[PDB]
C-alpha cells in the first residue's frame, strides 16, 4: 500500500483494501487471461493496468476483443491513406458509371 500510494499507480489504492491477488504478465495477451477467469464465476477481476492504461473490468473486456498490435498498426496505414484511395476511387468512379449503365442496358435484352 505505501509503495503504491507513493507510486505513479496510486489510483489502484481503493482496490487493495480487501484480500487480493496480483496477476503478472510479460508480453501480455488479455483475452487469454480472461478465458480462464471466465471458467470460474465467483473469481472477479477488478482493476488493472495494461501497457500504462488503467482499466476496470470493462476495459479488460475491451482490450480483449481487440486484434494484435501488428493488425492494428496494419489497418492504421489503410485508414490514413483512405483519403487518397478515395480521391482516386471517386475520380475513377465517373468512368465506371458508364460501364455499369451500358451493361445494365445489355442486361435488359
Amino acid at each position: 500500500k505505501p509503495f503504491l500510494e507513493e507510486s505513479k499507480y496510486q489510483n489502484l489504492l481503493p482496490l487493495f483494501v480487501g484480500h487480493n491477488l496480483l496477476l503478472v504478465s510479460e508480453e501480455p495477451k488479455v483475452k487469454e487471461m480472461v478465458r480462464i477467469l471466465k471458467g470460474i464465476p465467483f473469481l472477479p477481476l477488478l482493476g488493472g493496468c495494461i501497457d500504462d492504461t488503467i482499466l476496470s473490468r470493462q476495459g479488460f473486456i475491451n482490450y480483449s476483443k481487440l486484434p494484435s498490435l501488428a493488425l492494428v498498426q496494419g489497418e492504421l496505414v489503410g485508414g490514413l491513406t483512405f483519403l487518397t484511395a478515395q480521391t482516386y476511387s471517386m475520380l475513377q468512379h465517373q468512368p465506371r458509371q458508364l460501364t455499369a449503365l451500358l451493361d445494365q442496358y445489355v442486361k435488359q435484352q
Binding site: 487518397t84 480521391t87 482516386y88 475520380l91 465517373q94 468512368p95
Partner: peptide, 28 residues
C-alpha cells in the same frame, strides 16, 4: 476546393483520365 471542381469540370474525358493516371502515378 470549388476552383478545383470548376477546373476539373472543364477538362475533356481523356484529360480527366490523364489526371487519374498522373494521380495514381504520384500518390498511388
Amino acid at each position: 476546393i470549388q476552383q478545383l471542381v470548376q477546373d476539373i469540370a472543364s477538362l475533356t474525358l481523356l484529360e480527366i483520365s490523364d489526371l487519374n493516371e498522373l494521380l495514381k502515378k504520384t500518390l498511388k
